[PDB]
Amino acid sequence: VNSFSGYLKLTDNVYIKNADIVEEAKKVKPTVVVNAANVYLKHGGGVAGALNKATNNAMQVESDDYIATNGPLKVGGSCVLSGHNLAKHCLHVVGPNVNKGEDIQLLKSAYENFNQHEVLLAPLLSAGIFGADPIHSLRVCVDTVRTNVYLAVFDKNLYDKLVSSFL
Numbered sequence: 001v002n003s004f005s006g007y008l009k010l011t012d013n014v015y016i017k018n019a020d021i022v023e024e025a026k027k028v029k030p031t032v033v034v035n036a037a038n039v040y041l042k043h044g045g046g047v048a049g050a051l052n053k054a055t056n057n058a059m060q061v062e063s064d065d066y067i068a069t070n071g072p073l074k075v076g077g078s079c080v081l082s083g084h085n086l087a088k089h090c091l092h093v094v095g096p097n098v099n100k101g102e103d104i105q106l107l108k109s110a111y112e113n114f115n116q117h118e119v120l121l122a123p124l125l126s127a128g129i130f131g132a133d134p135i136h137s138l139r140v141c142v143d144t145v146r147t148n149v150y151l152a153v154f155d156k157n158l159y160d161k162l163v164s165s166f167l
């Protein structure tokens with residue numbers, strides 16, 4: 001039993017809700033919140049920009065030190081950093097950004113990072129400003145993640161479409 005509330009159950013381990021991941025994380029304070037990161041951990045917009053804003057830019061400061069030490073992530077890769085005031089940890093995961101021409105096949109590799117954590121609050125990878133089809137992202141999530149994932153979809157219209165079209 002966990003403290004996530006109001007989710008629709010899609011499979012044994014995947015749940016979905018219309019919610020602002022920022023407000024969800026603040027309410028639940030999960031062990032792991034997933035960020036929709038880019039390889040430079042520049043949290044300018046989308047989910048990343050919103051999560052960073054909620055940390056008063058502390059996420060960006062920590063991320064800049066991470067990059068200065070380690071260099072950029074790989075597309076499909078991840079790193080674990082602090083969750084600041086939002087969660088214990090933030091798993092920064094880089095899905096492919098279609099608006100950069102990146103290979104959509106890497107979306108499965110991106111979701112594989114979730115399997116290293118027993119429970120996660122997450123957005124749909126490569127959705128929104130990363131330009132992938134959210135219906136496809138949900139399918140890859142369900143077919144790749146085996147740990148317990150609580151998906152937050154900010155857009156109510158998109159949420160209803162994701163639920164109604166789910167196979």
Ligand SMILES: OC[C@@H](Cc1ccccn1)Nc1ncnc2[nH]ccc12
Binds near residue numbers: 155
């Ligand atoms: O896929 C992730 C995208 C989905 C999206 C957003 C808007 C319009 C269309 N798609 N973004 C988010 N998801 C959950 N919480 C969020 N908080 C801020 C941004 C955000």
Ligand SMILES: [Cl-]
Binds near residue numbers: 045047127128129
């Ligand atoms: Cl977005």
